[PDB]
Ligand binder design. Structure first.
Ligand SMILES: [Mg+2]
Ligand SMILES: [Mg+2]
Ligand SMILES: [Mg+2]
Lengths: 290, 285
């Protein structure tokens, strides 16, 4: 096990994904000969593989969620100081927590389907944290050692369902397709300091969110430590750590929201990029996502 | 039919309750008690099944619960008692999957907790994908019903922000079971007696008839905001009598307490309550 870090992915159509690793040239390398699936338990074997000996993946396959078996998704509310200032909101003394319904999980470039009658759809680029070891009353000093890696996330939100149908945010957060995750699970040795990564999100090519994780209010270690006093985080769990300024709900003089045909493009330094096309609601039938 | 899972945590086997109340081993028919296994388990010849020996622990009666959707205020008599208005749509929050526990398993209070509280609830286990389902079709998506205790920490729930889930996801705070009872045996889910005792003293008494949104209304509403997949658990609120609302003063859980609860046709739970300790590397559920 080396100390240079890895970028893992899962590639292929839904339900048929295969484990992979990104080489220095940006190619996917097939890990199927080393591990059957990219799970948290598979990482030890995957982290020891010799990239040079792995076959190049031909074509341009779909990226899936980069880790299989995410058990639950814990989400943070206000957590960027420059966002608090732009919204004129108090700096919290403890993190706001809510749950992102697992059924919202989707691949990084998968279509975003607006829910019924949605005119308040909104974007939130966030740093995601994938847990590698159980977190139960973990101190700040030991929190980051529990991390399997980092992932890019869009915490897609329906602001009417989130705030105008009661006080509980999860009602506007759990819609099918509202949590695209990926394209890479990037292990800590490759990310470096998670509190110094540039963040952005564009809509139809126009820059909406710009930030850097150095303005996080609670850093990753403090979030993991705090959350672990209220819920146990298990290997494979995902924590999404909040969003920088520039959400559509906060635009001035009037809020700006998603519409059918919009294109979101987002990225975080070291974590790759996502692109989602937004569609009007349709009945998704018996399809399973994630 | 009443299905169960028996044995030590992480080692449970699938079972069915026979006419005498004894557990019979289903392992010769299905390897696990999953939603996909129910048809084969329901269609099995109970006489072929061996009696389970010893008095084994009951586990969560269904394997593979993917997520737990919880309902807020949902009993008309509870709303009246608390002097709260009747909600016009159900409050939803998520009950952390890691709170899942066996029906009779120890309940560990969180660190320095003085606001631990009880909530007997009817649980609904989903059998078929629910995505924008009509009220008329909702009950047909149900695999079975289960007894639940929506254990809560009222200070974490209400005094650390506006989101209730922070006081509801603690380890051990969702005892589920002992039986997954299929709808044919339960009959009308809106005519079930409900009760919870603490140290043998009756705390909660009710009947599901007073639900504000019934199971079909809840499934239909929830399915417009979050897709329910087979194996998902919906917990549908609690009748009056929670410790938070006791008068002249609220009463909360303490180390040494014993909770005993039951819902008609769904069996009974008994939990001993303990003060906090670090639970190590244990994986609950
Ligand atoms: Mg967010
Ligand atoms: Mg007996
Ligand atoms: Mg409840």
């Amino acid at each position: 096990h080396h100390h240079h870090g890895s970028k893992f992915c899962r590639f292929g159509q839904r339900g048929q994904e295969k484990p992979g690793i990104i080489d220095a040239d940006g190619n996917i390398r097939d890990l199927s000969g080393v591990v059957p699936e990219l799970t948290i338990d598979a990482l030890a074997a995957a982290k020891g593989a010799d990239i040079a000996l792995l076959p190049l993946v031909e074509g341009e396959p779909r990226y899936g969620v980069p880790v299989k078996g995410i058990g639950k998704i814990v989400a943070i509310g206000l957590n960027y100081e420059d966002h608090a200032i732009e919204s004129n909101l108090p700096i919290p003394t403890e993190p706001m927590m809510f749950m992102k319904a697992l059924s919202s999980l989707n691949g990084p470039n998968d279509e975003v389907v607006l829910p019924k009658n949605s005119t308040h759809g909104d974007w939130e680029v966030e740093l995601g944290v994938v847990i590698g070891e159980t977190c139960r009353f973990v101190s700040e000093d030991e929190a980051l050692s529990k991390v399997a890696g980092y992932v890019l996330v869009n915490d897609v939100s329906e602001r009417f369902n989130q705030k105008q149908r009661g006080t509980q945010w999860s009602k506007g957060k759990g819609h099918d397709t509202f949590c695209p995750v990926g394209p890479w699970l990037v292990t800590p040795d490759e990310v470096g300091d998670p509190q110094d990564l540039d963040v952005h999100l564009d809509v139809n090519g126009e820059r909406m969110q710009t930030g850097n994780t150095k303005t996080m209010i609670f850093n990753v270690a403090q979030l993991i430590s705090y959350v672990s006093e209220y819920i146990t985080l298990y290997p494979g769990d995902l924590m999404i750590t909040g969003t920088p300024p520039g959400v559509g709900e906060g635009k001035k003089p009037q809020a700006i929201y998603l519409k059918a045909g919009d294109v979101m493009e987002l990225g975080i330094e070291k974590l790759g990029t996502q692109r989602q096309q937004v569609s009007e609601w349709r009945h998704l039938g018996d399809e399973v996502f994630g």
